[PDB]
Each structure stands twice: as C-alpha cells, then as structure tokens.
Amino acid sequence: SLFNSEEDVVKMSPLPTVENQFTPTTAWSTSVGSGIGNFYSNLHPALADNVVYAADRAGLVKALNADDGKEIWSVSLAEKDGWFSKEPALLSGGVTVSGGHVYIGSEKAQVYALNTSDGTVAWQTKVAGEALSRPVVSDGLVLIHTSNGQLQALNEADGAVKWTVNLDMPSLSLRGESAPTTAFGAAVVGGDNGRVSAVLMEQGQMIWQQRISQATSDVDTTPVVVNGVVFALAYNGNLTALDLRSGQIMWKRELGSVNDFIVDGNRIYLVDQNDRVMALTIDGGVTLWTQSDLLHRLLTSPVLYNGNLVVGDSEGYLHWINVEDGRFVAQQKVDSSGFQTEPVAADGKLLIQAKDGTVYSITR
C-alpha cells in the first residue's frame, strides 16, 4: 500500500485549550506498587463502605480509607513456589468488593477472595481460564467470565466451582472487559463471538441466546441492563438493544468501531476506537453530539460523574465533558504515567488508577 506508507500521518496537537469552568482537584493519591506498567489491564479500584480497594499487576492489594487515602491494609499475592523465585500474581480482573470479600482475577487462571477486614486470603480457586474481567457477585455466587469463553460460578464462601458454562471456544478475547451483568436472578454475558446470552444463576441454565454479530482492538463487551433492556456491544462495533425478558432484538446500529459505551437516563455515551466521543438517544436513533478533540489520545472508558462525562487518557489527563453538548468544561493533568483502566464513580467519589498504580480521588 504505497500511499499509506508514504504518509507521515503523525502528531496531533490534541490538548485542546479548555478554559476550566471549575477547579478539579486531588483529594488524595496513594501509590500501589508499580501498577500495570505497559501491560494492558482491566484492573481498577473498587469502593465499599468508605474503603477503596486497589491492586497492581504484580499482586499487591491495598485497602485505603476513602476519605484520606491512608492504608488500612496491604498484602501481596505474589507467591514463592518452594525452591523457585518469587513470581508476580498477574492480577488482571477486578477489583470487586461484596459482603466482606475482595475478589480479584488473574492471568494465571486464579481467582482470589480476600477478607475486607484484614486482607487475609479467604480462598483461592483455579479457574477455567484467564480472569481478565471483573468478578460479578450475585446471591452467594461469584461469576467469572474467562478469556477462553467460559462462564463459571464460584461459591462466594469457599470459592468452589458450582457450575461452568462453555459459552464459546475462541481464544482468546483480546482482554476486552467482558464481565457478566445481572438481572432478575439471571446473568447476561456478551462477548463470545458475537452472541449475547442469558443464563439462570441457580445452575447456569441457558435461558436465551441471541446472535447480535456475524461470527467473523479491545472492545468492552460487558452488557448493560437498564429497565428491561439489554444494551450489548459486539466486537465488530455493532450496538444492540435486546428485550431482557426474551432476548429479542429491539434495534441495532452498525457503528463500525466502538470501544466503550455507557448508558444513563436518555443517553448512550460511546467512545470509538479512534478516541472520538459521541452521545446518542436511548434508542440509538439520533446523534446528540460528537467530540473529536481527543482523537488518538487513547482514552479510558468514560464514567458519569457529577453531571459530567469524565475520561482519562494515556498522557495523564482527565477530561470533563458536558453531557448536554459534549463540550469540555474542565481539563486536568493528573499523573504522567497515564491512564488506561476505567475511572470509578461510587458513593460521591471519583477514583481512578494511573498506569504506575497510583490511585487518585478526584473532586469536581
């Protein structure tokens, strides 16, 4: 391809000049070892009962006071196998917190449950594949969607596998975030070679299955359930709405190349593969706005916080976007190792973890 080769397609001058309409600040930051470095990861902080739990790839896990960032505990899941030199745990999926346990998945097909109290290992279970998605907890069970297309349910108390459902044999879904979603005692799992499935939580019985993509970059295929509708993103950029009750397709938009989406009220917020942001009406029918100034800056998934859509980028900036017209309302240089994993909005807090592992609490 002579023409593509002869172009210096290069360089961007992103960093739109934004006149900040408020002053976003760091309430606190706390280091977490070396973070994920240059490895791709879905590891992000979790917040519960005023405690932020965060981890790094090597195996460090910290419990921090949500108000000041002070360490409540810290343990390492890195292990030394007899005579052999200590090895990183390669934590990848999580963190997730639920009823006294911190659940984390690993690239070594390990799932760990830690006690929120003191950080001691409640249990550890060998899982059917790499756990690169966040564990999802529902009625006594820890749902793990592995990278090799398996959906396993573990007993939250002892980690024993209750059931396994082979959803597809790839491999190995390019570590797109593909956690299950829950609703009415069911799990809805996407990803999987273009199919969305709903299975019963009890014994993993297939309730319905719907092809949203023709069979065949890291797309977040986690379905989002909202008032009886399932919003699912296929790997090929198709956004689809499905009736939760029956799995019947309501509508479909061939967006071509979407990395992430969230849904909220009457809007769907999308970030495309090239870091363009867009908002659509709930039915995906009308384009409300687009924002093109962040092209190629490699954005995190967006989060809705304090009325704004917030995304971080690889250069270490946070950008705050008016959800009405997609204009920037604030821009902030936070950490120069950059952002990659999702920002988290919980109980009034905005947490985000840089690549070097430093966790920030950001106030708007």
Residues in Cβ contact with 249 at an 8 Å cutoff, skipping those fewer than 6 apart? 210, 212, 240, 241, 242, 243
The pair of structure tokens assigned to 192 is 């999987």
**What gap in Å lies between CA 106 and CA 131, rounded to an integer?**
5
Query: CA 177, CA 221: separation in Å to the nearest integer?
Result: 6
Q: Quick one: resolution in A?
A: 2.1
CA dihedral 134→184→170→219, nearest 10 degrees, is: -60
- Radius of gyration, alpha carbons of the chain: 20
Give the sheet arrangement for strand 150-155, strand by strand. Answer: 136-138, 141-145, 150-155, 161-166
Q: Give one DSSP letter per residue of 37-71, joined into a string.
A: TTS------EEETTEEEEE-TTSEEEEEETTT--E
Distance CA 342, CA 178 (A): 13
Strand partners, 345: 350
Please, are residues 151 and 210 in contact by the beta-carbon 8 Å criterion?
no
Structure-determination technique: X-ray
Residue 311 forms beta bridges with which residues? 319
Please classify residue 82 by burial: count the beta carbons closer than 10 Å to its beta carbon, then call 0-12 exposed, 13-18 middle and 19+ buried: exposed
Nearest-CA neighbor of 33 among 89, 93, 81? 89
Q: Are 295 and 316 a contacting pair, CB within 8 Å?
A: no
Neighbouring C-alpha atoms within 13 Å toward the C-beta of 108: 16
- Number of Cβ within 10 Å of residue 80's Cβ equals 9
Cβ neighbourhood burial of 75 (10 Å; 0-12, 13-18, 19+):
middle
Dihedral of alpha carbons 205, 211, 212, 218, sign: positive
Distance of alpha carbon 278 from alpha carbon 311, whole angstroms: 13
Question: What's the rounded Cα separation, in Å, for the pair 56 and 360?
Answer: 14
Find out whether 317 and 332 touch, Cβ atoms under 8 Å: yes
206: amino acid identity, one letter: M
All structural domains of the chain with their residue ranges: 1-364
Question: Which contacts qualify for 273-278: CB closer than 8 Å, 24 or more apart?
Answer: 273/217, 273/237, 275/299, 275/313, 277/302, 277/309, 277/311, 277/321, 277/326, 278/326
Q: Are 51 and 359 in contact (CB under 8 A)?
A: no
Determine the residue type at 42. N
- Which residues pair with residue 74 across a beta bridge? 62
Distance between start and end Cα atoms, the chain: 47
Q: What are phi and psi of 5, to 5 degrees?
A: -75, -30
- Which residues neighbour 222 within 8 Å (Cβ) at sequence distance 6 or greater? 133, 177, 178, 179, 180, 181, 190
